[PDB]
Amino acid sequence: AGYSPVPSPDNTKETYWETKAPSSQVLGIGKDVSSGNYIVASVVAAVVGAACTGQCIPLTVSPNPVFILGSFLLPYSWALHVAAWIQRNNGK
Amino acid sequence: LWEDGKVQGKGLKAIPFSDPPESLPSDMVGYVGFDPLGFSTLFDIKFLREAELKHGRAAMLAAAGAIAQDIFTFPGVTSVIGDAKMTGAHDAFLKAAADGNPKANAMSQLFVWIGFFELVSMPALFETLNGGERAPGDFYFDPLGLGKGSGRARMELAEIKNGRLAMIGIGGMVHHYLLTGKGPIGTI
Amino acid sequence: MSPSVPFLKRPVALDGSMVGDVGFDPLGLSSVGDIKFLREAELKHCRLAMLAAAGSMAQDLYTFPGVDKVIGDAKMTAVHDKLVSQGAMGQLLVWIGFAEVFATMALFETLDGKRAPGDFKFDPLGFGKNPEALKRYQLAEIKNGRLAMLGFGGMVHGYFVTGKGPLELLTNF
Amino acid sequence: EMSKAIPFAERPAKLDGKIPGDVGFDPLGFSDYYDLKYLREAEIKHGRICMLGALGWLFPEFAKLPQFASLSTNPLKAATELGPAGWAQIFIFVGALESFSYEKIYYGDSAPGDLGFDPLRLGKNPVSRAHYEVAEIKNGRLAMIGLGGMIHHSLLTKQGAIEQIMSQNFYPSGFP
Ligand code: CLA
Ligand code: KC2
Ligand SMILES: CC1=C(C#C/C(C)=C/C=C/C(C)=C/C=C/C=C(C)/C=C/C=C(\C)C#CC2=C(C)C[C@@H](O)CC2(C)C)C(C)(C)C[C@H](O)C1
Ligand SMILES: CC1=C(C#C/C(C)=C/C=C/C(C)=C/C=C/C=C(C)/C=C/C=C(\C)C#CC2=C(C)C[C@@H](O)CC2(C)C)C(C)(C)C[C@H](O)C1
Ligand SMILES: CC1=C(C#C/C(C)=C/C=C/C(C)=C/C=C/C=C(C)/C=C/C=C(C)/C=C/C2=C(C)CCCC2(C)C)C(C)(C)C[C@H](O)C1
Ligand SMILES: CC1=CCCC(C)(C)[C@H]1/C=C/C(C)=C/C=C/C(C)=C/C=C/C=C(C)/C=C/C=C(C)/C=C/C1=C(C)CCCC1(C)C
Ligand SMILES: CC1=CCCC(C)(C)[C@H]1/C=C/C(C)=C/C=C/C(C)=C/C=C/C=C(C)/C=C/C=C(C)/C=C/C1=C(C)CCCC1(C)C
Numbered sequence: 001a002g003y004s005p006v007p008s009p010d011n012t013k014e015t016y017w018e019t020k021a022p023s024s025q026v027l028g029i030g031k032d033v034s035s036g037n038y039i040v041a042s043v044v045a046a047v048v049g050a051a052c053t054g055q056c057i058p059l060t061v062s063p064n065p066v067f068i069l070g071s072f073l074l075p076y077s078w079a080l081h082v083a084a085w086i087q088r089n090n091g092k
Numbered sequence: 093l094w095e096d097g098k099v100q101g102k103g104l105k106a107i108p109f110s111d112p113p114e115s116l117p118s119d120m121v122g123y124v125g126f127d128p129l130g131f132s133t134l135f136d137i138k139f140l141r142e143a144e145l146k147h148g149r150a151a152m153l154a155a156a157g158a159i160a161q162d163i164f165t166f167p168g169v170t171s172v173i174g175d176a177k178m179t180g181a182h183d184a185f186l187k188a189a190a191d192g193n194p195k196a197n198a199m200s201q202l203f204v205w206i207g208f209f210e211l212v213s214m215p216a217l218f219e220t221l222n223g224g225e226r227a228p229g230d231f232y233f234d235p236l237g238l239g240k241g242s243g244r245a246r247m248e249l250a251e252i253k254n255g256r257l258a259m260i261g262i263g264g265m266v267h268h269y270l271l272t273g274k275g276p277i278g279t280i
Numbered sequence: 281m282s283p284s285v286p287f288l289k290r291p292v293a294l295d296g297s298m299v300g301d302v303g304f305d306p307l308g309l310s311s312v313g314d315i316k317f318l319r320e321a322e323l324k325h326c327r328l329a330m331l332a333a334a335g336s337m338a339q340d341l342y343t344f345p346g347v348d349k350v351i352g353d354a355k356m357t358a359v360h361d362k363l364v365s366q367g368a369m370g371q372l373l374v375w376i377g378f379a380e381v382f383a384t385m386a387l388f389e390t391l392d393g394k395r396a397p398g399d400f401k402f403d404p405l406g407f408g409k410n411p412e413a414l415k416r417y418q419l420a421e422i423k424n425g426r427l428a429m430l431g432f433g434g435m436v437h438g439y440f441v442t443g444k445g446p447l448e449l450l451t452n453f
Numbered sequence: 454e455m456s457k458a459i460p461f462a463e464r465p466a467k468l469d470g471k472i473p474g475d476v477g478f479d480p481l482g483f484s485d486y487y488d489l490k491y492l493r494e495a496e497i498k499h500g501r502i503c504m505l506g507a508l509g510w511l512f513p514e515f516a517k518l519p520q521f522a523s524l525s526t527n528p529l530k531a532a533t534e535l536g537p538a539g540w541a542q543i544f545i546f547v548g549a550l551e552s553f554s555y556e557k558i559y560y561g562d563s564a565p566g567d568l569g570f571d572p573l574r575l576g577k578n579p580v581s582r583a584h585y586e587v588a589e590i591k592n593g594r595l596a597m598i599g600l601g602g603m604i605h606h607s608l609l610t611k612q613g614a615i616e617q618i619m620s621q622n623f624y625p626s627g628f629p
Binding site for chain 1: 198215217218221222231
């Protein structure tokens with residue numbers, strides 16, 4: 001009980017949840033984004049990332065930087081659609 | 093011409109022996125009581141009406157454009173796409189784009205701009221589905237103020253009916269082209 | 281609502297307070313992030329892009345003595361590429377980076393609420409005093425900067441398509 | 454007190470015969486341990502899967518989509534031949550369908566197997582609805598059995614069901 005208080009970064013809120021969905025403070029900068037916005041973002045990111053990955057699957061010795069960058073949207077789309085589900089069940 | 097009892101809505105029943113689904117609303121413009129396969133039960137009628145109006149507008153444009161292309165083609169397009177009609181013109185423009193003629197990027201420009209409008213309007217569909225003020229199809233684009241007040245009833249029903257007719261007509265046009273190779277005018 | 285896009289709801293973040301706010305955010309990019317940060321970015325881009333557009337036109341018209349020998353027939357991005365080797369672009373980068381470190385301090389102040397976005401207290405000739413004037417000149421700055429972003433994009437991409445600078449292009453087409 | 458299915462054994466306590474497709478058949482007593490509603494939903498889903506599977510095990514032997522004409526009449530060989538992209542699209546379609554089932558199971562209460570899919574409104578008449586519920590359960594059971602048999606027959610003979618019947622190689626030669 002004598003332990004020193006644990007320092008945490010500024011603006012650290014309580015994110016623990018036993019509800020159906022987290023509190024939308026889990027989504028940070030995107031907490032105020034709409035669920036429809038997240039859905040469209042996830043679909044667009046999935047399509048673009050899949051296309052840019054297919055444009056690089058037989059990787060050459062000089063891959064396109066824009067295709068490399070866009071391929072990171074397929075992993076991004078997963079988080080986007082998770083956020084979409086979170087934001088649909090939190091009222092938005 | 094809302095004519096809720098004559099041309100749309102209320103007891104209007106396309107199929108006398110089978111009643112319409114409970115989900116289908118009578119208040120929607122163009123309600124003849126037609127939904128035998130119960131699509132309205134499966135999907136939100138707001139989404140279906142947005143889709144119907146978008147399809148009707150695209151098909152009306154496509155039919156009018158097929159007629160216009162068959163009767164007239166702008167000065168110079170013949171140089172870039174030879175003689176091409178209907179979907180042949182689409183394929184020809186894409187072909188020339190691949191061939192490297194900079195003049196043949198019409199379809200790419202069309203896609204860019206139409207997709208820009210669709211991307212910026214998608215939130216409108218989401219807001220409509222989320223119980224927003226917007227009706228399924230109204231984009232508030234009435235510059236000339238043609239449909240204002242009394243006309244709205246007939247204008248909306250006319251839009252839907254002409255759009256359905258154009259949906260059928262453009263399909264007929266495209267398939268007649270695929271078989272005969274002619275245009276909407278050549279066939280007739 | 282949304283006067284700009286009449287078929288979309290007014291953006292939640294945008295209340296119409298800021299200059300040049302026509303409720304334009306169809307994709308909802310103001311919901312993500314802080315609107316002060318986005319306004320600082322917008323004014324940075326506005327000023328940079330309008331300087332860039334005026335510079336493109338002015339380089340097309342006039343060039344300083346002895347630059348023709350260094351750059352040859354290069355225009356626009358070709359001038360960039362040519363003078364990176366010479367070292368001009370490096371010196372510009374050094375000095376702009378100095379100014380931008382201090383602008384980093386300014387942005388950190390803005391996010392804390394101390395500084396209004398885009399306000400560096402740069403008014404030598406003293407144009408903006410009549411609070412009315414500054415209120416007009418702010419709207420004019422935003423509008424001209426937006427027009428200039430679009431204009432510089434058009435100039436650079438016209439150079440890409442044709443290889444001609446803005447006014448040289450406009451003369452012949 | 455006594456099971457209908459097994460007249461010489463006592464009726465399972467949870468299976469009182471009220472639920473559709475109940476004849477008191479539970480010799481190993483799954484209903485006592487596991488949640489009966491979950492079991493009913495699982496049975497209905499398996500029956501639907503196997504009804505479609507049994508139909509599609511034989512349909513390609515009668516007609517094929519023009520795109521997949523080359524693919525073998527053997528359903529397993531056709532599965533191998535389809536390729537990742539088409540299988541990925543089928544998987545996405547199935548997962549989109551199963552999102553609704555996920556919602557109805559974990560975040561909703563409803564009649565087992567009720568996902569709201571009744572576009573043709575064939576279930577409004579209560580008597581026809583009862584017959585259709587029992588018919589769905591029983592056709593699903595028969596399809597489960599038949600499709601398991603079909604999968605094993607295709608494994609053995611390396612041919613389609615109709616082809617196996619026509620060639621009359623009903624009997625095995627050993628393990629593959
Ligand atoms: C709809 C159900 C169905 C049908 C119509 C068929 C049809 C067929 N199967 Mg079978 N099969 C089925 C389900 C079915 N199967 C299932 C669910 C499995 C397990 C996954 C199998 C596993 C299987 C294998 C492994 C093989 C077949 C094979 C065959 C073929 C030859 C059968 C044969 O030789 O019978 C002979 C019949 C018997 C030996 C009868 C079993 C012996 C006991 C003593 C019978 C007891 C009778 C008793 C009264 C039953 C009820 C008692 C209870 C009420 C207390 C034939 C096309 C063969 C094949 O195609 O080879 C290429 C083959 O090798 N099947
Ligand atoms: C008014 C201000 C001014 C500016 C802002 C400016 C900017 C730049 C830049 C931009 C980054 C470059 C890259 C550049 C390059 C050269 N300048 Mg120049 N210059 C200015 C003034 C003069 C004057 C007065 C002279 C001169 C010259 C040269 C020569 C010589 C070439 C040679 O002789 O081989 C070269 C290579 C001399 C010359 O020859 O001019 C006929 C000369 O006398 N410059 N100069
Ligand atoms: C604030 C302040 C001060 C200051 C200051 C300063 C230095 C202010 C400088 C302001 C400037 C340089 C503004 C420039 C705006 C340029 C625009 C809008 C260009 C648009 C181009 C377009 C649309 C285009 C185009 C085109 C395209 C795309 C295609 C091309 O083929 C050609 C074409 C042309 C047709 C002072 C010094 C007074 C002191 C004061 O105490 C504080
Ligand atoms: C929900 C709903 C709808 C619906 C629907 C639909 C589409 C319903 C579809 C139902 C289907 C396709 C049912 C298929 C059942 C197949 C069975 C039972 C096969 C058994 C095979 C056996 C026993 C075998 C075998 C064999 C084996 C194993 C070995 C072989 O040697 C011999 C043999 C071949 C005999 C619609 C869309 C109308 C909407 C409406 O609002 C309600
Ligand atoms: C551009 C392009 C292309 C293209 C293309 C395009 C644009 C293709 C478009 C195809 C279209 C629009 C097809 C429409 C079919 C409509 C049917 C069958 C309606 C049936 C209605 C019935 C049966 C009604 C029945 C009845 C009902 C329901 C109600 C009342 C009574 C009645 C009305 C009789 C390609 C494909 C060539 C490729 C090319 O490389 C690029
Ligand atoms: C500029 C400078 C001067 C002095 C000091 C200072 C630190 C400031 C320094 C700054 C340096 C900076 C900011 C460097 C930044 C560099 C960065 C971020 C480099 C990133 C490189 C990443 C690369 C290639 C990634 C390529 C990825 C590939 C192929 C992936 C492959 C694949 C893809 C894309 C899809 C299919 C699967 C497969 C084949 C595996
Ligand atoms: C994943 C994979 C790996 C390798 C194979 C393959 C490529 C096909 C692929 C897929 C495999 C799949 C989907 C396999 C599925 C297997 C299936 C569905 C097997 C089914 C087995 C069914 C059996 C025994 C049923 C036995 C029924 C019995 C006694 C009934 C007896 C009864 C009678 C006679 C009277 C009344 C009482 C009672 C008990 C009902």
